[PDB]
UniProtKB/Swiss-Prot annotation:
Effect recorded for residue 398 to A: Small change in glucokinase activity
Protein name: Hexokinase-4
Binding site for ATP: 68-73, 214, 281-282, 318-322, 395-399
pH profile: Optimum pH is 6-8 with glucose as substrate. Optimum pH is 9-10 with glucosamine as substrate.
Reported effect, residue 51 to S: In MODY2; decreased glucokinase activity; decreased affinity for glucose; increased affinity for ATP
Its biological purpose: Catalyzes the phosphorylation of hexose, such as D-glucose, D-fructose and D-mannose, to hexose 6-phosphate (D-glucose 6-phosphate, D-fructose 6-phosphate and D-mannose 6-phosphate, respectively). Compared to other hexokinases, has a weak affinity for D-glucose, and is effective only when glucose is abundant. Mainly expressed in pancreatic beta cells and the liver and constitutes a rate-limiting step in glucose metabolism in these tissues.
Gene: GCK
Length: 443
């Protein structure tokens, strides 16, 4: 049959309750490996200490600048903390050319510094010297709140001279090379962490941050005794899991499919960020493409006919997956339209089913990691039912028509003894860097 042979292929994307439970428990075990001194260095899940600590509430009053780098698109923000407490923000967006992302680190940071300069000119404040927080969305071994070494680029970044170097130093050196303004860089955080802190400001039960964007990652508050990499037992510290690398020691092998290996082999970082490659917005559009090329070379789609755009890597953009999915066949009709194609009414349906297969597997995979984080925190405390708040940001989670609903329901089935509240960050990845800076300044 025509339709059933297609479902057979699509069916491989399914994950049973038991699969997701198995993925979850293994995540918890990799988490524990990343935390312990004995196994940390070999851990796929690095559980990197952030120096962001549980602390009495409050910060300095004043103006704070934040930068947010985590993709081709980035953001400068001016945040005003006033006191009872109020936080007001102003932002601008900047798009980074390919040139600046695949040349040197100096070039990337000079662009960045040019953007800051623009931001300050347009807010009549170029003569002010302010504290600055930096949300830097790549794996970093922190040595303190304001010092961190880039372990490796992810999500397709390549700038040379950065890995192994203090990223804060590179920011400052670029600022000084320009000589057009001055800033005190006082903090550097992951986007998870910034999202968590921005969320915590609104709801003090927010102790987890998650991003499902171009990439996928989470952070959470750990007891200090469990954070063996940092001396001390008292209080809590935020740990940047870098769960994107889950599977990099083979933990997911049984779940990986042909199209996953192919996305991985042609990615900027083969063999790394495998769990992220199942989920992130960087890759979800490409997985879909590769599936359609299977259904075309099975003679099961576009009467066996595939365009030049579809023969070419990157053409099926994650934004398309989101639109396809958002019953009269009209958007689907007008994403395919441009790609040089003529859906039957059946192709519209098939394409939609593919999008949905890849997207559903992402929400389900993602849900298992977060359940792991959440269920581990519950277990570490004295909870029958743990009430917890999770701050979330990212273009997949926000904009993807039903990714979020599928994710929510899957998460909830795996965390039957927690009641979870999701706070969707308006601009948390940037705002949280200002708020951490304000707390850092208080000391
Ligand atoms: O920023 C924080 N810790 C921190 C910051 C800097 C340094 Cl060096 C060390 N630890 C803590 C981490 O909390 C995580 C949840 O347990 O976050 C905060 N600490 C204190 N007041 C905080 C926050 C976040 N918002 N607020 C806040 C509240 C009211 C006004 C302004 C702020 Cl801003
Ligand atoms: O941007 C979301 C995430 O992307 C990748 O997983 C980065 O390695 C990570 O640091 C970041 O939190
Ligand atoms: Na410790």
């Amino acid at each position: 049959s025509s339709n059933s042979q297609v479902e057979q292929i699509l069916a491989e994307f399914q994950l049973q309750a038991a699969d997701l439970k198995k993925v979850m428990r293994r995540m918890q075990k990799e988490m524990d490996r990343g935390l312990r001194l004995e196994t940390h260095a070999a851990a796929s899940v690095k559980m990197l200490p952030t120096y962001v600590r549980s602390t009495p509430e409050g910060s300095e009053v004043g103006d704070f600048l934040s930068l947010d780098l985590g993709g081709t698109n980035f953001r400068v923000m001016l945040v005003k903390v006033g006191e009872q407490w109020s936080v007001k923000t102003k932002h601008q967006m900047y798009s980074i050319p390919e040139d600046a992302m695949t040349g040197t680190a100096e070039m990337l940071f000079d662009y960045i510094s040019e953007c800051i300069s623009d931001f300050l000119d347009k807010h009549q404040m170029k003569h002010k010297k302010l504290p600055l927080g930096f949300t830097f969305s790549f794996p970093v071994r922190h040595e303190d709140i304001d010092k961190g070494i880039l372990l490796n680029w992810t999500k397709g970044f390549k700038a040379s001279g950065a890995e192994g170097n203090n990223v804060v130093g590179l920011l400052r050196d670029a600022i000084k090379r320009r000589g057009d303004f001055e800033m005190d860089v006082v903090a550097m955080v992951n986007d998870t962490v910034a999202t968590m802190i921005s969320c915590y400001y609104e709801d003090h039960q927010c102790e987890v941050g998650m991003i499902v964007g171009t990439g996928c990652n989470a952070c959470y508050m750990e007891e200090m005794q469990n954070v063996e990499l940092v001396e001390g037992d008292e209080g809590r510290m935020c740990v940047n899991t870098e769960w994107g690398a889950f599977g990099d020691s083979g933990e997911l092998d049984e779940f990986l499919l042909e199209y996953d290996r192919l996305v991985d082999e042609s990615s900027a970082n083969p063999g790394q960020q495998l769990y992220e490659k199942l989920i992130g917005g960087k890759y979800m559009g490409e997985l879909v493409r590769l599936v359609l090329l299977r259904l075309v070379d099975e003679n099961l789609l576009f009467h066996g006919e595939a365009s030049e755009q579809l023969r070419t890597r990157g053409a099926f953009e994650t934004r398309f997956v989101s639109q396809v999915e958002s019953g009269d066949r009209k958007q689907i009709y007008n994403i395919l339209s441009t790609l040089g194609l003529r859906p039957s009414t059946t192709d519209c349906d098939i394409v939609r089913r593919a999008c949905e297969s890849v997207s559903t597997r992402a929400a389900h995979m993602c849900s298992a990691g977060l359940a792991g984080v959440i269920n581990r925190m519950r277990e570490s405390r004295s909870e029958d039912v743990m009430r917890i708040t999770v701050g979330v940001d990212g273009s997949v989670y926000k904009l993807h028509p039903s990714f979020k609903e599928r994710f929510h329901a899957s998460v909830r089935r795996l965390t039957p003894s927690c009641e979870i509240t999701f706070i969707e960050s308006e601009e948390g990845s940037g705002r949280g860097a200002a708020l951490v800076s304000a707390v850092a300044c208080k000391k």
